[PDB]
Amino acid sequence: FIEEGTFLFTSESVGEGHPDKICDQISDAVLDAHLQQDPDAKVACETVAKTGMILLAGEITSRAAVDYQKVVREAVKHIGYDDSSKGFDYKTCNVLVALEQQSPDIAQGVHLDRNEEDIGAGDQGLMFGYATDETEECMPLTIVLAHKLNAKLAELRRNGTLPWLRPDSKTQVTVQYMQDRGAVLPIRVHTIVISVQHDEEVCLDEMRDALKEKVIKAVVPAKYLDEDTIYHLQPSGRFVIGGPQGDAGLTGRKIIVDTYGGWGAHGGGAFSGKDYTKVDRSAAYAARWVAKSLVKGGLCRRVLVQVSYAIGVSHPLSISIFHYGTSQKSERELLEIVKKNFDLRPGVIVRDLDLKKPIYQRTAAYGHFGRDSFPWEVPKKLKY
Amino acid sequence: FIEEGTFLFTSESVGEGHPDKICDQISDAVLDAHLQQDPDAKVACETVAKTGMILLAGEITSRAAVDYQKVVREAVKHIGYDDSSKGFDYKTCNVLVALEQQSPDIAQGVHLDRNEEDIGAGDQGLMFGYATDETEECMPLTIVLAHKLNAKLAELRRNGTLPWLRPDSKTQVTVQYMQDRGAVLPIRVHTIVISVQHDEEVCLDEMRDALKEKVIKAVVPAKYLDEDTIYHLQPSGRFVIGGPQGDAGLTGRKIIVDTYGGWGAHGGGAFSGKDYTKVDRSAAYAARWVAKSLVKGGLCRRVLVQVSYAIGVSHPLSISIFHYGTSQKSERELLEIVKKNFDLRPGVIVRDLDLKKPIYQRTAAYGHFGRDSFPWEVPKKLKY
Ligand SMILES: Cn1cc2cc(-n3cc4cnc(NCC(F)(F)F)nc4c(-c4ccc(Cl)cc4)c3=O)ccc2n1
Ligand SMILES: Cn1cc2cc(-n3cc4cnc(NCC(F)(F)F)nc4c(-c4ccc(Cl)cc4)c3=O)ccc2n1
Ligand SMILES: C[S@@+](CC[C@H](N)C(=O)[O-])C[C@H]1O[C@@H](n2cnc3c(N)ncnc32)[C@H](O)[C@@H]1O
Ligand SMILES: C[S@@+](CC[C@H](N)C(=O)[O-])C[C@H]1O[C@@H](n2cnc3c(N)ncnc32)[C@H](O)[C@@H]1O
Ligand SMILES: [Cl-]
Ligand SMILES: [Cl-]
């Protein structure tokens, strides 16, 4: 039963060994390796994963000397794919590279002979930032719980207490919310899905019991779970084949997992493998920073920000703020506050958010937002 | 100046030769080729494009005998990449294939020994459908105009009137809207961006003049354009290198272009290269069908629908309808109407929307929604 004024919302997350997420992490390991040697590296590194194969494809212009074999294989090792029995092995997989320089036509139109603050956007596009006061970290509970379920699986795999676990996993959480003057209040968890790759020996009942008792109960507060919560645990019945062997991975195929779990809005751009001149990442990070600053500044409880760019043009084409009815300020007033406090040119975002720093591999699993006090998660004190 | 009660929104689109879109079209050409011979083919075909290369990667179990070289090259020919001078040539590129059977573990958990109507979802995930009465086709004007600008470029390339054009293009449209009791009314076009690949001989002024006079004016009604509309036409200054040579392409990297241009919501799943058992596509198509049926049925002016699944489970885990204040019915009443009129199991969607038919390549440019009276665009007459 859904009481009037309440509603359901669902988000998902995936683990570090999910094949798409493998690709995001490798793309960002490559980015970080370049940035460690050349803070101004121009990087657009896609990764593709299938059985036995990591392929890097894209465009990099950089003064760095990067050992792609080592970078790729160390990222896969970190994830946990270290033996043919698990379906993938960093020691013995194929690493292919189809990397060229950045197009000179892009370079000339974006950054050649431009003052850093006045570099053009590296592409056109639209980006959104979102924040919600329903959790301290200003993220939707649906996505936070989904991420934490995957993190718990990785924790119990790595600590050896559930040694039948393997790195590829997916989770999904449906929460019922109460409307509260434009904001939302979580009531209960309606449905949880967990699927995780596993060894050939463990049986379904052992896995389902462990997923409930050692994963869900260790993550989701009991106050949100009741006798009617629906659990779909290993619903396919068998998930021995996994990782890239089970399903091809590509960079930028988990963009909703990377952001807000379907809340807010999304402009379509992927984050991983891209340096700060690619506004798909830098402007989305800055828009998150704006949104979170508006909420933590007490101006909104819930807020969406849209920005957009034209390739070669530094300033956003427009900015808009939607507060869901949760501000006493008007949309015009909030925009004025944002314009007075933020400069969303990529060549200024880079300074404010320290986006030449090689921290990107850390962003590439468990969402880019709501964790670890990255610069875009530290609210700006607003003057108005 | 933005009057209170009005706001800006931006969407983008890309052309048929945009490298990500090339990949979507190839993935769906492969799907269609399989379905022409085996309506029950299980297809999960990713495409990757870089200079000189189309790679197919993924999982296909099918009784069809498909000539991947021919299918790929004919799709690239159709797009218009037919000479080294354009950066890519269907006759002479490399076509690599890394395709395996569908994982038997997925097959057993999804469809093996299951009645078709009771096939499980091919994955977990969340999907949204959206419709808006602001255009006859029930799509956001921002995205419709952006698509039409790309289509116009392709038209003028193919008819030889702008022979300097090449297949890779991007467009972006910002519209100012009036709020209208939860619905939206377009007022004016605020900013247009167009970038299109071009030959080495044509100059920037000739291109910018043509883009305004022969493309924008031929697409965007004059009533929406005024002396303050901002035009960013060839803003990078030079776009001779393009297609995969300029920028790697991957399937499923234009998911917001494929859907609502940022309006509504998105669950993250990509459409192209996937048969109907992959709910990322079938359930999103069905959710669009539901949303459009609610609007065309006079129950809403604007509506968002969320559904979600667990792998192996046929019925959606939940359904929710949000009408933005544009229905006299409650959310409970709309849900009741939807449940009485629709069955969102994938093995029923396939019948209602005829999803074994090989029409998918046609969906893979210019958006999956709002055009050509595909089955999900033909509203269902609702009984209640
Ligand atoms: C006074 N008040 C009214 C309110 C209405 C509020 N609300 C109620 C909703 C009810 N159902 C659904 N269903 C899910 C759907 F099917 F749409 F996808 N979504 C809602 C959303 C919502 C819409 C789009 C997105 Cl991306 C995220 C959430 C919402 O914001 C919340 C607080 C309120 N306070
Ligand atoms: C009485 N009434 C009130 C209304 C408010 C309405 N509205 C006003 C908006 C104002 N600004 C923005 N800015 C863009 C942003 F920055 F948020 F991304 N978005 C709005 C949206 C909107 C929110 C999320 C999404 Cl995906 C798409 C559109 C909206 O729905 C529309 C009709 C109304 N009628
Ligand atoms: C279900 S697969 C997508 C469909 C697949 N490409 C096919 O050929 O049917 C998407 C993700 O689900 C997970 N997955 C893979 N095998 C699975 C299985 N046997 N059971 C449950 N989930 C699985 C992995 O995380 C994988 O990346
Ligand atoms: C700008 S590229 C993304 C960045 C690129 N990977 C890099 O290395 O900087 C994204 C898309 O923009 C378009 N594009 C490519 N070259 C361009 C140019 N010189 N000017 C404008 N747009 C261009 C193509 O549609 C391409 O797929
Ligand atoms: Cl997936
Ligand atoms: Cl792009």
UniProtKB/Swiss-Prot annotation, chains A, B:
Residue segments, region Flexible loop: 102-114
SUPFAM superfamilies in alphabetical order: S-adenosylmethionine synthetase (SSF55973)
Cofactor binding, note field: Binds 2 magnesium ions per subunit. The magnesium ions interact primarily with the substrate.
Cross-link Glycyl lysine isopeptide (Lys-Gly) (interchain with G-Cter in SUMO2) residue location(s): 217, 223
Molecular-function GO term, any one: identical protein binding
Modified residues (N6-acetyllysine): 70
Sites where the protein binds K(+): 46
Binding of L-methionine, residues: 59, 102, 247, 278
Pathway: Amino-acid biosynthesis; S-adenosyl-L-methionine biosynthesis; S-adenosyl-L-methionine from L-methionine: step 1/1
Binding site for ATP: 18, 168-170, 236-239, 247, 253-254, 270, 274, 280
EC number: 2.5.1.6
Gene Ontology BP annotations: cellular response to leukemia inhibitory factor; cellular response to methionine; one-carbon metabolic process; positive regulation of TORC1 signaling; protein heterooligomerization; protein hexamerization; S-adenosylmethionine biosynthetic process
Keywords: Acetylation, ATP-binding, Isopeptide bond, Magnesium, Metal-binding, Nucleotide-binding, One-carbon metabolism, Phosphoprotein, Potassium, Transferase, Ubl conjugation
GO cellular component: cytosol; methionine adenosyltransferase complex
Annotated PROSITE patterns: ADOMET_SYNTHASE_1 (PS00376), ADOMET_SYNTHASE_2 (PS00377)
Positions contributing to Mg(2+) binding: 20
Superkingdom of the organism of origin: Eukaryota
Subunit structure, as described in the record: Heterotrimer; composed of a catalytic MAT2A homodimer that binds one regulatory MAT2B chain. Heterohexamer; composed of a central, catalytic MAT2A homotetramer flanked on either side by a regulatory MAT2B chain.
Membership in a protein family: Belongs to the AdoMet synthase family.
Function, in words: Catalyzes the formation of S-adenosylmethionine from methionine and ATP. The reaction comprises two steps that are both catalyzed by the same enzyme: formation of S-adenosylmethionine (AdoMet) and triphosphate, and subsequent hydrolysis of the triphosphate.
UniProt protein name: S-adenosylmethionine synthase isoform type-2
